[PDB]
Amino acid sequence: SGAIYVGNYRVVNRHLATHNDWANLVWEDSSRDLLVSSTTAQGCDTIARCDCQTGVYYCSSRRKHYPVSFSKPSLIFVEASEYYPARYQSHLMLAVGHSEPGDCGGILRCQHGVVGIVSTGGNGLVGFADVRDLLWLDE
Ligand X SMILES: COc1cccc(NC(=O)N2CCC[C@H](C(N)=O)C2)c1Cl
Largest CA distance in the chain: 39
Least separation, in Å, of the C-beta of 50 and Zn ion?
A: 3
Residue 2 contacts residue 128 (beta carbons within 8 Å): no
Closest-CA residue to 4 (of 51, 66, 63, 48): 48
Among 26, 52, 76, 78, binds Zn ion (CB under 5 A): 52
Closer residue to ligand X (CB): 22 or 83: 83
- Other beta carbons less than 10 A from residue 84's beta carbon: 15
Determine if residue 110 is labeled as part of a ligand binding site: yes
* Candidate list 33, 91, 103, 130, residue with the active-site label: 33
- Residue 52 binding result from ligand X, Zn ion, none, given CB thresholds of 5 to 8 Å by partner type: Zn ion
CA dihedral 23→26→29→34, nearest 10 degrees, is -80
- Name which of residues 61 to 100 contact Zn ion (CB under 5 A): none
- Residue 89 binding result from Zn ion, ligand X, none, given CB thresholds of 5 to 8 Å by partner type: ligand X
Question: Which residue numbers are catalytic?
Answer: 15, 33, 104
- Which residues does the annotation place in the binding site for Zn(2+)? 50, 52, 110, 112
